[PDB]
Design an enzyme around this catalytic site. Structure first.
Site, PDB file in Angstrom:
ATOM      1  N   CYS A  83       0.800  -1.224   0.000  1.00  0.00           N
ATOM      2  CA  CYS A  83       0.000   0.000   0.000  1.00  0.00           C
ATOM      3  C   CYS A  83       0.838   1.282   0.000  1.00  0.00           C
ATOM      4  O   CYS A  83       1.564   1.561   0.955  1.00  0.00           O
ATOM      5  CB  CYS A  83      -0.948   0.016   1.202  1.00  0.00           C
ATOM      6  SG  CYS A  83      -2.104   1.415   1.153  1.00  0.00           S
ATOM      7  N   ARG A 115      -0.140   4.643   2.709  1.00  0.00           N
ATOM      8  CA  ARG A 115      -0.061   4.495   4.157  1.00  0.00           C
ATOM      9  C   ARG A 115       0.230   5.731   5.013  1.00  0.00           C
ATOM     10  O   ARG A 115       0.154   5.664   6.235  1.00  0.00           O
ATOM     11  CB  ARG A 115       0.934   3.386   4.492  1.00  0.00           C
ATOM     12  CG  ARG A 115       0.365   1.991   4.272  1.00  0.00           C
ATOM     13  CD  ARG A 115       1.398   0.924   4.616  1.00  0.00           C
ATOM     14  NE  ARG A 115       2.379   0.734   3.548  1.00  0.00           N
ATOM     15  CZ  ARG A 115       3.520   0.072   3.701  1.00  0.00           C
ATOM     16  NH1 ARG A 115       3.820  -0.456   4.882  1.00  0.00           N
ATOM     17  NH2 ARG A 115       4.349  -0.088   2.673  1.00  0.00           N
ATOM     18  N   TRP A 159      -9.318   5.989  -1.176  1.00  0.00           N
ATOM     19  CA  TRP A 159      -9.608   6.633  -2.447  1.00  0.00           C
ATOM     20  C   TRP A 159      -8.596   6.136  -3.467  1.00  0.00           C
ATOM     21  O   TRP A 159      -7.562   5.587  -3.103  1.00  0.00           O
ATOM     22  CB  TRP A 159      -9.595   8.169  -2.326  1.00  0.00           C
ATOM     23  CG  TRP A 159      -8.361   8.778  -1.722  1.00  0.00           C
ATOM     24  CD1 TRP A 159      -7.170   9.023  -2.346  1.00  0.00           C
ATOM     25  CD2 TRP A 159      -8.208   9.227  -0.373  1.00  0.00           C
ATOM     26  NE1 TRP A 159      -6.283   9.601  -1.466  1.00  0.00           N
ATOM     27  CE2 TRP A 159      -6.892   9.734  -0.248  1.00  0.00           C
ATOM     28  CE3 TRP A 159      -9.054   9.248   0.747  1.00  0.00           C
ATOM     29  CZ2 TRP A 159      -6.402  10.259   0.954  1.00  0.00           C
ATOM     30  CZ3 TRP A 159      -8.570   9.770   1.939  1.00  0.00           C
ATOM     31  CH2 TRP A 159      -7.251  10.268   2.033  1.00  0.00           C
ATOM     32  N   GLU A 184      -4.505   3.476 -10.993  1.00  0.00           N
ATOM     33  CA  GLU A 184      -5.299   2.253 -10.821  1.00  0.00           C
ATOM     34  C   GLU A 184      -6.398   2.198 -11.888  1.00  0.00           C
ATOM     35  O   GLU A 184      -6.680   1.143 -12.459  1.00  0.00           O
ATOM     36  CB  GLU A 184      -5.936   2.208  -9.422  1.00  0.00           C
ATOM     37  CG  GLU A 184      -4.945   2.151  -8.249  1.00  0.00           C
ATOM     38  CD  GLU A 184      -5.645   2.178  -6.889  1.00  0.00           C
ATOM     39  OE1 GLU A 184      -5.686   3.250  -6.239  1.00  0.00           O
ATOM     40  OE2 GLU A 184      -6.171   1.120  -6.479  1.00  0.00           O
TER      41      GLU A 184
HETATM   42  C1  HEM Z   1      -6.435   6.611   1.135  1.00  0.00           C
HETATM   43  C2  HEM Z   1      -6.115   6.131  -0.090  1.00  0.00           C
HETATM   44  C3  HEM Z   1      -5.356   4.988  -0.398  1.00  0.00           C
HETATM   45  C4  HEM Z   1      -4.620   4.879  -1.538  1.00  0.00           C
HETATM   46  C5  HEM Z   1      -4.354   6.030  -2.532  1.00  0.00           C
HETATM   47  C6  HEM Z   1      -4.108   3.525  -1.610  1.00  0.00           C
HETATM   48  C7  HEM Z   1      -3.483   2.991  -2.735  1.00  0.00           C
HETATM   49  C8  HEM Z   1      -3.135   1.647  -2.892  1.00  0.00           C
HETATM   50  C9  HEM Z   1      -2.586   1.097  -4.116  1.00  0.00           C
HETATM   51  C10 HEM Z   1      -2.280   1.843  -5.422  1.00  0.00           C
HETATM   52  C11 HEM Z   1      -2.390  -0.205  -3.902  1.00  0.00           C
HETATM   53  C12 HEM Z   1      -1.801  -1.119  -4.973  1.00  0.00           C
HETATM   54  C13 HEM Z   1      -2.897  -1.891  -5.687  1.00  0.00           C
HETATM   55  C14 HEM Z   1      -2.420  -2.495  -6.987  1.00  0.00           C
HETATM   56  O1  HEM Z   1      -1.231  -2.839  -7.071  1.00  0.00           O
HETATM   57  O2  HEM Z   1      -3.228  -2.636  -7.924  1.00  0.00           O
HETATM   58  C15 HEM Z   1      -2.800  -0.498  -2.542  1.00  0.00           C
HETATM   59  C16 HEM Z   1      -2.699  -1.748  -1.914  1.00  0.00           C
HETATM   60  C17 HEM Z   1      -3.154  -1.997  -0.591  1.00  0.00           C
HETATM   61  N1  HEM Z   1      -3.852  -1.059   0.197  1.00  0.00           N
HETATM   62 FE1  HEM Z   1      -3.982   0.901  -0.030  1.00  0.00          FE
HETATM   63  N2  HEM Z   1      -4.467   2.792  -0.486  1.00  0.00           N
HETATM   64  C18 HEM Z   1      -5.255   3.688   0.264  1.00  0.00           C
HETATM   65  C19 HEM Z   1      -6.019   3.300   1.388  1.00  0.00           C
HETATM   66  C20 HEM Z   1      -6.089   2.019   1.914  1.00  0.00           C
HETATM   67  C21 HEM Z   1      -6.898   1.649   3.072  1.00  0.00           C
HETATM   68  C22 HEM Z   1      -7.921   2.502   3.807  1.00  0.00           C
HETATM   69  C23 HEM Z   1      -6.601   0.366   3.361  1.00  0.00           C
HETATM   70  C24 HEM Z   1      -7.115  -0.452   4.409  1.00  0.00           C
HETATM   71  C25 HEM Z   1      -7.437  -0.096   5.688  1.00  0.00           C
HETATM   72  C26 HEM Z   1      -5.667  -0.054   2.349  1.00  0.00           C
HETATM   73  C27 HEM Z   1      -5.179  -1.342   2.266  1.00  0.00           C
HETATM   74  C28 HEM Z   1      -4.351  -1.822   1.265  1.00  0.00           C
HETATM   75  C29 HEM Z   1      -3.913  -3.198   1.195  1.00  0.00           C
HETATM   76  C30 HEM Z   1      -4.286  -4.300   2.213  1.00  0.00           C
HETATM   77  C31 HEM Z   1      -3.154  -3.291   0.062  1.00  0.00           C
HETATM   78  C32 HEM Z   1      -2.421  -4.528  -0.400  1.00  0.00           C
HETATM   79  C33 HEM Z   1      -3.169  -5.363  -1.418  1.00  0.00           C
HETATM   80  C34 HEM Z   1      -2.420  -6.632  -1.782  1.00  0.00           C
HETATM   81  O3  HEM Z   1      -1.587  -7.100  -0.967  1.00  0.00           O
HETATM   82  O4  HEM Z   1      -2.667  -7.159  -2.880  1.00  0.00           O
HETATM   83  N3  HEM Z   1      -5.336   0.958   1.458  1.00  0.00           N
HETATM   84  N4  HEM Z   1      -3.277   0.669  -1.905  1.00  0.00           N
HETATM   85  N1  LIG Z   2      -7.178   2.762  -3.813  1.00  0.00           N
HETATM   86  C1  LIG Z   2      -7.193   1.545  -3.323  1.00  0.00           C
HETATM   87  N2  LIG Z   2      -7.480   1.377  -1.993  1.00  0.00           N
HETATM   88  O1  LIG Z   2      -7.853   2.323  -1.143  1.00  0.00           O
HETATM   89  N3  LIG Z   2      -6.908   0.532  -4.179  1.00  0.00           N
HETATM   90  C2  LIG Z   2      -6.698  -0.863  -3.846  1.00  0.00           C
HETATM   91  C3  LIG Z   2      -6.869  -1.914  -4.768  1.00  0.00           C
HETATM   92  C4  LIG Z   2      -6.653  -3.280  -4.403  1.00  0.00           C
HETATM   93  C5  LIG Z   2      -6.258  -3.637  -3.055  1.00  0.00           C
HETATM   94 CL1  LIG Z   2      -6.022  -5.315  -2.685  1.00  0.00          CL
HETATM   95  C6  LIG Z   2      -6.043  -2.699  -2.009  1.00  0.00           C
HETATM   96  C7  LIG Z   2      -6.267  -1.232  -2.378  1.00  0.00           C
END
Ligand code: HEM
Ligand SMILES: N=C(NO)Nc1ccc(Cl)cc1
Ligand code: HEM
Ligand SMILES: N=C(NO)Nc1ccc(Cl)cc1
Ligand SMILES: N=C(NO)Nc1ccc(Cl)cc1
Ligand SMILES: N=C(NO)Nc1ccc(Cl)cc1
Ligand SMILES: C[As](C)(=O)[O-]
Ligand SMILES: C[As](C)(=O)[O-]
Ligand SMILES: [Zn+2]
EC number: 1.14.13.39
Lengths: 416, 414
Positions: free
Chosen positions: B118, B121, B290, B295
């Site tokens: 992520c 974070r 968001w 993406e």
């Molecule tokens: C606030 C905006 C946030 C943005 C911009 C963001 C963005 C991203 C992006 C770009 C990925 C990569 C996905 C891909 O490779 O296609 C990701 C993965 C991840 N995000 Fe975030 N994230 C945000 C919020 C969150 C929140 C609120 C959570 C959970 C409480 C979260 C949990 C995760 C997890 C668990 C992954 C890993 C997915 C995996 O292992 O395949 N994200 N995030």
């Molecule tokens: N913008 C995102 N999350 O907030 N995208 C996103 C897409 C796939 C996974 Cl697993 C976790 C996060």
């Protein structure tokens, strides 16, 4: 299922198993506790200077493995010549502490080294490498001749040909043959009074070393550096490459007529010269190799990296983009046109080059050939996917298994 | 042991000591690195028919409780000591235990904080946590899910949130949201094996039809939700159209882009991942924040196995699609990402570009270095799908490892 890594291609949904990793005899930097795959120079292969002759026991086993690979390659595994060659190596290592490779053995090993490089996306060409045997070289001056010939044959007036020149291997408690420059062709990097750098910041140290050794520095942004060549137990000697041998390509853009006024340019031949070639335990500290460029190496990395030429902002300004905000994607727009200019210019000058799309596709073909030929292919995802448009290429969606196979190319400590 | 981590742009160096706290094994070994693999071959989350080893669960629980009290600076306090006794008591008598709401809140945020892939974070401390552990039916899950969506969307001013449904229990089926996201476009297989809509959702689309959904025939038909209560067949629920905010895609300067009829939803709410806190497992805990423009613009719209609109946009732009060297794919992709950014900003819907996002992650890395002595990060995922080296994260070495609380993948309920 199979007790080997399961590899998936998420675009096509296809699956394969890597059984080749079973052959790896050298540990990488990862452990079940944490992955260190992203590190550029992990203290693993790092061929740190090991002066005192190597344990005949460790060397012999590495040599035996290589000889088996060689005889397997010519389909004579277990034959009389195979067992005799094995005997010969053991005998030679027994009386001299080391051994020597036969011509054909060197050629096979050099090619395998390329084939085994996890970070190289151009391995579909591995079978076509011109191996120059320079193991008779005895002086820094002769090294220069061998290098000049390499450049001429490899450059071939733009119709580039992959090649590698191999100098004498490291000997028991004796000085190493070394090429101090990281590449045979490098632009000077001049430290400025204000702290900035004129030219290529990546070459500040080597440039200063050339000066310390008698080179009369210039003051341009693309000054070709002289070579610092070092024969055993001798100080490095300075050699200036004749201009007619260093083919460069002035950069212009297919539609942006002003791009040419930028006065940017790059050299045609990518010849890495500071890596160590290891074959059957033997170490070739000086063995420059070259192929041809993938456009992103020049247009994205060398020209746009923040710690390199860093021309992104200049080009964006010329394109009248809003460099005041990220969401205008000005960096992305300029990067694209810069990469296009590189491809366009090389094509115009009839100099070999390959874009990241063509290259990655050919690598997918290589993975298929290798799957059949060896049961897999060691590959470093972070290095195989291009610096721009990553997910637009096929390799991004292909899972990869990374491991060390020998023969191999390894980084080694700087000689100074 | 403790890895030396270097940033090649700035030349700075740090040492990750936080990885030593990892108690769960990844897929790599000294023989070969498998960092590029998307899913675990074994690190899955096997069935829960029998109670997890008391010893193992008790150690995971004590560690979590320990983390919690340190978070509130009350370690070793009377409350800390007594709470540990409570957990000990429940596990020994029931083979399991339950978290207090405040603990659940702390754990959810830590799971997000620990997520290696992520890039967003830096926002980890700002997460609205909805406790839905007192849900006993699919219908009730729907009501919770709807409130999550209303809250998170906030009329375009997105707010990060997670809703946590009942934890897994030995010998009992799991609560599960069958959809991978609360909002997904249908994927219909037709005639010659082609696909109208989102190819990624073909299976889930058919499951919905098999369960009574009357399918549409559009490219962007919002799918219904298949919610499942323990040991019960999943139920179908159609989401109120006014709850699903969408953004029509148009380009700042290319007038014809709007004619493409492209669009995407505002809320990215993942609902198929498992949330693990102190050994307890939450099979249904949809979370959302968001989108990062890439993406949508790059992956969702440009992946060959997704909407694959690259060629169409290229032809509209009248580009030389005859050869790779013209970089038509690269040019089209950039304009598409520009369209997504333009559109979301025009619609007043929260979105972040990859440059901004990566810059903020670098700050997060620094914040985490000081706070915990490191930050688990997965280079392949932190670096965006386009313009990789044009972002700072590309030049930053990273150390990847598993910390708990954590989000993890789990088997598809069918
Ligand atoms: C606030 C905006 C946030 C943005 C911009 C963001 C963005 C991203 C992006 C770009 C990925 C990569 C996905 C891909 O490779 O296609 C990701 C993965 C991840 N995000 Fe975030 N994230 C945000 C919020 C969150 C929140 C609120 C959570 C959970 C409480 C979260 C949990 C995760 C997890 C668990 C992954 C890993 C997915 C995996 O292992 O395949 N994200 N995030
Ligand atoms: N913008 C995102 N999350 O907030 N995208 C996103 C897409 C796939 C996974 Cl697993 C976790 C996060
Ligand atoms: C035919 C043209 C070739 C192309 C297009 C090609 C392209 C590349 C590219 C893009 C990289 C990564 C560059 C980086 O990110 O720093 C690379 C790495 C590598 N290539 Fe090739 N290559 C070619 C020929 C060769 C040859 C002739 C050899 C050796 C005989 C070779 C050996 C290597 C090695 C050892 C690396 C890894 C270097 C490292 O560890 O950083 N390549 N190649
Ligand atoms: N195209 C290239 N070689 O042929 N590029 C290249 C660049 C750096 C190293 Cl170390 C190895 C290869
Ligand atoms: N880099 C990624 N970001 O989403 N993902 C990713 C996608 C496919 C493979 Cl094989 C490996 C990694
Ligand atoms: N992906 C690369 N290709 O050249 N290089 C690269 C650069 C910096 C880090 Cl930290 C990791 C990898
Ligand atoms: C083109 As220049 C400013
Ligand atoms: C919009 As054009 C086809
Ligand atoms: Zn690894």
């Amino acid at each position: 299922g199979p007790k080997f890594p399961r590899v998936k291609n998420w675009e096509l949904g296809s699956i394969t198993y890597d059984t080749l990793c079973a052959q790896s005899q050298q540990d990488g930097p990862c452990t079940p506790r944490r992955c260190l795959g992203s590190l550029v120079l992990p203290r693993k292969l790092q061929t740190r200077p090991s002066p005192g002759p190597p344990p005949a026991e460790q060397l012999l086993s590495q040599a035996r493995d290589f000889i088996n690979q060689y005889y397997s390659s010519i389909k004579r595994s277990g034959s009389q010549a195979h067992e005799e060659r094995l005997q010969e190596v053991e005998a030679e290592v027994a009386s001299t502490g080391t051994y020597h490779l036969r011509e054909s053995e060197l050629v096979f090993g050099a090619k395998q080294a390329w084939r085994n490089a996890p970070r190289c996306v151009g391995r579909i060409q591995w079978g076509k490498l011109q191996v120059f045997d320079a193991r008779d070289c005895s002086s820094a001056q002769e090294m220069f001749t061998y290098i000049c010939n390499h450049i001429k044959y490899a450059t071939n007036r733009g119709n580039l040909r992959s090649a590698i020149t191999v100098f004498p291997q490291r000997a028991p408690g004796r000085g190493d043959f070394r090429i101090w420059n990281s590449q045979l062709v490098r632009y000077a990097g001049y430290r400025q009074q204000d702290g900035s750098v004129r030219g290529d910041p990546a070459n500040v140290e080597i440039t200063e070393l050339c000066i310390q050794h008698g080179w009369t520095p210039g003051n341009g942004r693309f000054d070709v550096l002289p070579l610092l060549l070092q024969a055993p137990d001798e100080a490095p000697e300075l050699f200036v490459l004749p201009p007619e041998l260093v083919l460069e390509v002035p950069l212009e853009h297919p539609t942006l007529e002003w791009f040419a006024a930028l006065g940017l340019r790059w050299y045609a031949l990518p010849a890495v010269s500071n890596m160590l070639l290891e074959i059957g335990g033997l170490e070739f500290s000086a063995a420059p190799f070259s192929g041809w460029y993938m456009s992103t190496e020049i247009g994205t990395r060398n020209l746009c990296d923040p710690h390199r030429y860093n021309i992104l902002e200049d080009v964006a300004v010329c394109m009248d983009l809003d460099t005041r905000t990220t969401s205008s994607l000005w960096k992305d727009k300029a990067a694209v046109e810069i990469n296009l200019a590189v491809l366009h210019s090389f094509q115009l000058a009839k100099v070999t080059i390959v874009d990241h799309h063509a290259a990655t596709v050919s690598f997918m073909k290589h993975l298929d050939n290798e799957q059949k030929a060896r049961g897999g292919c060691p590959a470093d995802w972070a290095w195989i996917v291009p610096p721009i448009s990553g997910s637009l290429t096929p390799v991004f969606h292909q899972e990869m298994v990374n491991y060390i196979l020998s023969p191999a190319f390894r980084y080694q400590p700087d000689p100074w």
